[PDB]
């Protein structure tokens, strides 16, 4: 069942990606912002910046050097200001992209190369593994997560009193379907008879609020009887 669910989920990733193109919005925004900054910088060449005309050859021709110098200097100031604005925008955008690249490095090194317990670091839910996939100017993970689906109620209790001694589960939780009591692991329903090989004793009944009454079976008694 698990392998079939995994294959079906991979196939769903295939379908989602192959159909809807709005999934790579981040990479597309990076490319679009860069292309827009570049086209703005280029279209800034066609500005007068206050001069008589943007064409440097036109200015150099139609004015004598003594005054064409001040015209060309005005154009220089304009174009240099535009270029410096572009370089500042690129510095800031590169800081942000490097933030995302450090984040991708961390995410790959923890998610892929290992298994991270950091909640919602590796996709909503409990984490199992995650395989990377390249992408133009980026990376794409497939965070294979584990999600629980079908649950019941199972009235519970913090501990049980067997011989006046309180018994807590070593690894699990006490539940009662409505008929008897059982101790099962916390994330998957798997009831088991309350034996002393699953729980441990501590103190007595005079402390634990909400304790209940039951008998914890012992495997040593039948082995002694037989």
């Amino acid at each position: 069942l698990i392998a079939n669910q995994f294959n079906s989920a991979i196939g769903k990733i295939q379908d989602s990606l192959s159909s809807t193109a709005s999934a790579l919005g981040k990479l597309q925004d990076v490319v679009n912002q860069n292309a827009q900054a570049l086209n703005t910088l280029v279209k800034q060449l066609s500005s007068n910046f206050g001069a008589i005309s943007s064409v440097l050859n036109d200015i150099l021709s139609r004015l004598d050097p003594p005054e064409a110098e001040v015209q060309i200097d005005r154009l220089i100031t304009g174009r240099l200001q535009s270029l410096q604005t572009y370089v500042t925008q690129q510095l800031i955008r590169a800081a942000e992209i490097r933030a995302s690249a450090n984040l991708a490095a961390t995410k790959m090194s923890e998610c892929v190369l290992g298994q991270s317990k950091r909640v919602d670091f590796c996709g909503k839910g409990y984490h199992l593994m995650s395989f990377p996939q390249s992408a133009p100017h980026g990376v794409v993970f497939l965070h294979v997560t584990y999600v629980p689906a079908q649950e019941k109620n199972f009235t519970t209790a913090p501990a049980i009193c067997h011989d006046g001694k309180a018994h807590f589960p070593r690894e699990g939780v006490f539940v009662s379907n409505g008929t008897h009591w059982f101790v099962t692991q916390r994330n998957f329903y798997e009831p088991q008879i309350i034996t002393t090989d699953n729980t441990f004793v501590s103190g007595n009944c005079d402390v634990v609020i909400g304790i209940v009454n039951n008998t914890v079976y012992d495997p040593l008694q039948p082995e002694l009887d037989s």
Binding site: G138, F141, P148, N153, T156
Partner: peptide, 20 residues
């Protein structure tokens, strides 16, 4: 409640995608 709980029986293996 103070004595009710909920415990899963089944489980789905979802596969999300995270672009960076």
């Amino acid at each position: 409640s103070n004595n009710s709980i909920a415990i899963p029986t089944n489980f789905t293996i979802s596969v999300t995608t995270e672009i960076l």
